[PDB]
Design a protein around this ligand. Sequence first.
Ligand SMILES: Cc1ncc(COP(=O)(O)O)c(C)c1O
Ligand SMILES: Cc1ncc(COP(=O)(O)O)c(C)c1O
Ligand SMILES: Cc1ncc(COP(=O)(O)O)c(C)c1O
Ligand SMILES: Cc1ncc(COP(=O)(O)O)c(C)c1O
Lengths: 454, 463, 454, 454
Amino acid sequence: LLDSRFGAKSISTIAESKRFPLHEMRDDVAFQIINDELYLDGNARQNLATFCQTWDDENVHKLMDLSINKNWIDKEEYPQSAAIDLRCVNMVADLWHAPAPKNGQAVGTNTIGSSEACMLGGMAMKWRWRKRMEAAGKPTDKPNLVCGPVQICWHKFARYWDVELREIPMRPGQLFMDPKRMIEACDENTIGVVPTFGVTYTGNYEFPQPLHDALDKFQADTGIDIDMHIDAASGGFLAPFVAPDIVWDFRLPRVKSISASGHKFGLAPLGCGWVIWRDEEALPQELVFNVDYLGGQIGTFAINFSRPAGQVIAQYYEFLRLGREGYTKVQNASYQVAAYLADEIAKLGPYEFICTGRPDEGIPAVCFKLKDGEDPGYTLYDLSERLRLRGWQVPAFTLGGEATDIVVMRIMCRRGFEMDFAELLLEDYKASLKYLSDHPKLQGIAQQNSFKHT
Amino acid sequence: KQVTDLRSELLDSRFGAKSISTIAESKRFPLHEMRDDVAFQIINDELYLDGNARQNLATFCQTWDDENVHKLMDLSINKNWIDKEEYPQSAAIDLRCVNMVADLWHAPAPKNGQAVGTNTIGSSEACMLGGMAMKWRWRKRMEAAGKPTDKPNLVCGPVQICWHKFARYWDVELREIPMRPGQLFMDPKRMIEACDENTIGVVPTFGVTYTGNYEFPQPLHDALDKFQADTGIDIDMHIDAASGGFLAPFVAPDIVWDFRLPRVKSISASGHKFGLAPLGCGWVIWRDEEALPQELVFNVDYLGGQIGTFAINFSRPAGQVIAQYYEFLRLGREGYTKVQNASYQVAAYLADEIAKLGPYEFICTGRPDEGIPAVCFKLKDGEDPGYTLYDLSERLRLRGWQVPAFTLGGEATDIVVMRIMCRRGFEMDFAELLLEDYKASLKYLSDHPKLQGIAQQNSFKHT
Amino acid sequence: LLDSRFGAKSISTIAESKRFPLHEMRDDVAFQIINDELYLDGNARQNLATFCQTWDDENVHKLMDLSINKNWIDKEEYPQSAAIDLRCVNMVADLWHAPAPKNGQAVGTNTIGSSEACMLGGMAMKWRWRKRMEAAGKPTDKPNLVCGPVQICWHKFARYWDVELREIPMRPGQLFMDPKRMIEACDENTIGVVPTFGVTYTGNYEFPQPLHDALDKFQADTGIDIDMHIDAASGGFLAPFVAPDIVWDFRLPRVKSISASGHKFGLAPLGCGWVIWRDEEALPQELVFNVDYLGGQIGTFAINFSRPAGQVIAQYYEFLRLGREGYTKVQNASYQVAAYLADEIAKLGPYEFICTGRPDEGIPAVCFKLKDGEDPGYTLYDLSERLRLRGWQVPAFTLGGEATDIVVMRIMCRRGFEMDFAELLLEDYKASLKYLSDHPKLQGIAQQNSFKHT
Amino acid sequence: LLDSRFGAKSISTIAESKRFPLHEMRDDVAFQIINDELYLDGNARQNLATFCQTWDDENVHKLMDLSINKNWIDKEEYPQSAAIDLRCVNMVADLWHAPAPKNGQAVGTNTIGSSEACMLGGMAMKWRWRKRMEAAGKPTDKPNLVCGPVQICWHKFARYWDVELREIPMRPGQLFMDPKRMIEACDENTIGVVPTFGVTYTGNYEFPQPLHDALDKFQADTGIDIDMHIDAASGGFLAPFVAPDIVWDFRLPRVKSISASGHKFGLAPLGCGWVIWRDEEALPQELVFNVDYLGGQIGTFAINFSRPAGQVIAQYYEFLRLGREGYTKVQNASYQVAAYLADEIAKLGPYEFICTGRPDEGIPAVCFKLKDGEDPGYTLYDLSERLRLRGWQVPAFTLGGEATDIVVMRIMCRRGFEMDFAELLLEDYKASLKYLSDHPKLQGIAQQNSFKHT
Ligand SMILES: Cc1ncc(COP(=O)(O)O)c(C)c1O
Ligand SMILES: Cc1ncc(COP(=O)(O)O)c(C)c1O
Ligand SMILES: Cc1ncc(COP(=O)(O)O)c(C)c1O
Ligand SMILES: Cc1ncc(COP(=O)(O)O)c(C)c1O
């Protein structure tokens, strides 16, 4: 067996792939072998399911390349990377109207993604709640967390830290966590409420303000003081620029912490998250670990330790080059694309929209389902498959709870998916509808949900 | 007439233009846009303030530069490790790596072809996952027995901070056997004294962070067998092989520390350490399906079915996994053996050479059978050469070297040690230069006695 | 022995480091080996001792890479490089107010640096002087040169060309060459006076005008006609832009030649110098050598012969992209940083400043010493060592002459050392002072002068 | 006026090329403007006149690019570059059989090229001679130097340092410095003899051994002790590999110093020279200057000061990757090309060869003239012009002395000019001959000498 690339004895990667390789191989052959199979990966340019950055900027590539060995945890050897990281924490804190620091540095940290940021926020919430119950001489025996249609990271948090997850069910007419149902789920064991400022499954915002009012009335009627952690994975880098009037952040007294993804609308490369706390009081010191460095010690509250500092550096690059002025324009461009697709798609079939890409309602996304008791001659699963044959990945999936029988299609508009590409999508969308119309036997065959978690 | 306080002033000599002071507005989110290339050069220029770690002998993390690794990482910047759907080849390469590492550690042959394990950001996450699984297995055993599960504890030696975090975050009592003069590590006797029915497991550190020595699981495994025999209490182990996991399999195959031992239910290691991968790569392997409680695994829907994942992080880059595979492919056992041996030769050389320069007692001398490629020593008790290791460390910094001097924990807290790490890139020629600067530092301290005792700050020791 | 990079038998560069290597080695291995140890060199970004360019410009790297084989002396094969070189000579001549050329080309040449430029200037001075003395049948074996705190290249000139060096001593209150002491050293054997327009050790300018007037009076009283050569290594590319009114160049009749460094404030990469002569009469033709080429013979006055033309090309790039407009802003930026540091440092200790970075007084540098009889609890040597531990190289050294007891600290502000970096230096400066204060035993230990020559 | 490249108002480099630009210009525009006119430079691949390296090696480009700012004189900031430089000096010393250092370091230095190397060697020669005459109570007012057909750098040395240059004339039947004529020119005022181990104009070696014998006899008959400096600009990196048995170096007692060009057959990029002294006694300490550094103090004997360290590094790269083994094969390849050309060219016309590319006679060069009283119907100048029309630069010029009536053609074979290219040259050579034969009126028209100095 020979290889046509190297014109030599074949070196299989699929063979003996269950055992650690025995011999050495020429460096450049190993590289070309791996490089060639990586072509099997998609480039995600036509993938409209993910929230994660997929566009390419030469400067970001250069910054990441230079940072490949810069250790985020090693403040001693990489002091400048550490300083840039502190700047970012302050800037994000400022973006979310966090109270002015006493010493001068905001309370918060960079993370690998929103998952870790949420875990940290969740543990802090659990610890503050525990300190309160013990002081009240009550049992910390069975904590619970109230939320709406949260992302899987919260299910993991609940599971891994033994907290009862009280998720308000998604239901026809009310897909999100409303004040009434939220209150019905709250009690003395509730460690906190987690509104999702940009629901993963639909793109809509769960507004913290009305929930905050309900929590104020709750403490007035029962004495039970409940706080909030905002999961703003996507919305945290949207609303501050295109809808400053929405009061969802630290302007609300009960919001003790907020988390968001830099690698989503924060525009940073994969591997960047953020979590900020209102003030020192919001973060139990018992969770912070202090390590020694030549220049004094620094407290850290993170799950990960050693990791590259490139994403933080790239995130800073975006903050510096764009500013509020730049982010507003970038974000608005995505909202224009989403709004356009919503309006245009509505003219093509009997659809009921859950999200239409409006800045005041949520993120740059379009989410719809077929109108009840209406049969256009295909399901959204069938349409999704036709679109894949044209290179597009437009996820079709079912919602949860009382709406377990509802099938929706979600389109995400992130940086890089410009108006020109949306127009092409519409062309292929129309072509797919005509094909389904000309080949009725297709209806009902496709029935597998697409990846919806990110 | 333009008051200095009402202006975004300052001319810049690089751009032949003005302003843009990262430190001035550093507390607020920037207001305006800036030319991309100017923002890039501004950031690129201050990154020069970071060290390159070539002369840093404190860290275990990879610091050498390989062109092919730079290319693989550059092409993987947007490849999402969690998105199996869009990046199927990256996911396949990742599964190969898990099987290869499992094979490396003698994990039993999979009943369905795929080993039980996962890639991680680093050893910290790997350890958390291993720790959670240990806690869950212990809990189930106890619940199946109708016993209380509210007082779990974990027995270990001089562990890395990630275990202190695990204990704190998951409410597990950490029973760390104290480091002490004459016994700095977890021995069978003290280990057993700390074990009971609430012990979720024992965590030997196969390559102690602070000294470089291996804690040998075999003797501890025998003690646990005797323990079960005398009490009926069945205790398992998780090996924290952050560094050793990619050393002993190549240069000391005969040390029995892995899955060859029945009680070892899981093992974790750092790819970005001696695994030779770029920062951001860890590994955790479980003996088999039984070793990993399914309640911890989450199954997500994909167009091709569903894949279960047990991880704390979600979205993140797949470049390090790919780079790690590149190392596995180009080196193999044959290549890793030569690479690791080269580091041991340097370490052994430094130990032997440094021993001739002062009254030192060595804790680690870079021997393959004893631990990792590191040198760890302290001044002999009651010996005053005319300086402390802190003073020596500072003199070496003036020569560009970062050789950490710090104190040991427990009841050995009065011990000041110096640790030298020998990782890929720190070749024999550089070790010779270190020796030259070491001797020059000693002569300077000898000629300037007033220096003794002044320096007294510990260096970063955690990695 | 094995190498952990190549995973093969070790190849040491120290073992047989005194004998020519016996065998071949794979090219790439040789490259990586050398590349890896070059990491032991500093990048000079935190080095505030040198005057030489240390910033990086992508365009300059490209021009230099393209010119690696372009031979400066081979006018025949590289006609365009030779043309660009001629343009630069004329532009520098124009910058220094040299009289308009008769034929059209200014009299001058590019050099490797100011050293060579000064040798050429020195030889021409010696020759012009000799031609005068020889006509009067007087001895020409005991020539002397009058100057102030000159750079080492003049000591080399004096030594290599057997010229008595009459250096006016540096002294408290009079660290530079003044008119009075200058005249006291002049006689019929003086080949010329060399004012240093930007003293290496302090940064101050020695003003040619007052010296020029003294020389006019000298000729009036004795008949002895003495000329000048301005060593403007640094000042030559500063004053013409930020202080045009200072009369130090060819506007002065006696100034027969001027030299300066392109690789200093000229902004060119290492390896570029310039020397210009007032006119043909100022340059003895006996020193010029004519070499034949296909297009005709070209004369040259240079110590070096074959060498690369990249630096000249890079220098032209700076001239073209900046112009007077651009150079003024670039140099002003450096002066602002220097002025800022001087003002800020003065608030931290009992210091006496010799140079405070004022455009009318000298170059962008800060030079100071501890006030006489003041004991802050440390020497500038101690402070310098503390700053090294923070990555900075701020030279502390002693002055010459009578000010031999004086120890100064000199900070150079060149392109790349922006305001933000100066702020960081101030932070580390303060940190160093606090450490010295908390550790008194450190005082007096350090006593080695740093490199001060460039 | 518009520019077709930038599609905007034209920017001319010609317009006011004699004045320093007044305004700024876009950097990328300035770069492209300069990049575009550099295309007017030749690449020298078909230039067979120069000895300087013109081939391109990717690793050398990388090493030079990395070293653009590394200052050769700043031992403090660039310790590793300084170390590599010391290794090179020792390796070159070893190559020339210099006595083993009484300490651990050979006596010598790197230079910009052979010119500076020769000046340093010449100065040392003059100083040693002066010291001796003084110790004999004799005058030192009329120093002279005996040599053969030397390169222009020695004419410069003689002129700049006031030494009478006694150059033995090139003559038909005696083009080089022979023992007899050398002795006729020697006296008590001779500072030394300079044999040229690879004559620039022809390529032949002047053998130091026979000359050395004559000088031994001279001291025996007169007591006058005369030393030598070998100008081995080209031969210094040829004979040690391809003809080790030729005794021309430090194996000869009288050879006190040797110089050679790294950027010639040393294979280094432009800007690299070397000069080695036999031992400390051979280098008068009065010429060495000691400068202080934090690491202590190092001595240097150099005309230049600040300059790039890249060539030294690239030179080290060649030493490391090739070794004696590699240089022998590289140099041999050039000799094979030269020998082939000589043998083939001899069959095309009535020629008399002065150099035929034989390793035992000289460097890889071919030098010939038309046989006396032979008229093939063209001059070598005519042939040279025809070859230029085919892209080749094969210099035709006259020899000096009474050989001023001798027109020769010299072909240099350096790295890169492989056998395949030589065959192409022969094709064009024959084509040129046929053209000249078919167009007789061309004979005698061309009469300008080509650049012959390097
Ligand atoms: C609301 C929400 N939270 C958390 C996550 C997980 O973010 P990450 O993948 O960056 O950890 C996602 C994708 C999300 O949409
Ligand atoms: C034994 C040990 N465990 C865990 C860690 C943490 O690994 P990481 O920094 O890769 O999370 C280290 C550094 C270590 O030495
Ligand atoms: C006043 C002065 N003259 C000459 C020099 C030497 O210049 P170069 O290093 O460019 O030869 C320097 C450094 C200097 O400061
Ligand atoms: C014999 C000889 N000496 C000196 C030189 C000048 O060398 P460089 O150009 O390197 O100064 C040459 C070209 C030469 O051929």
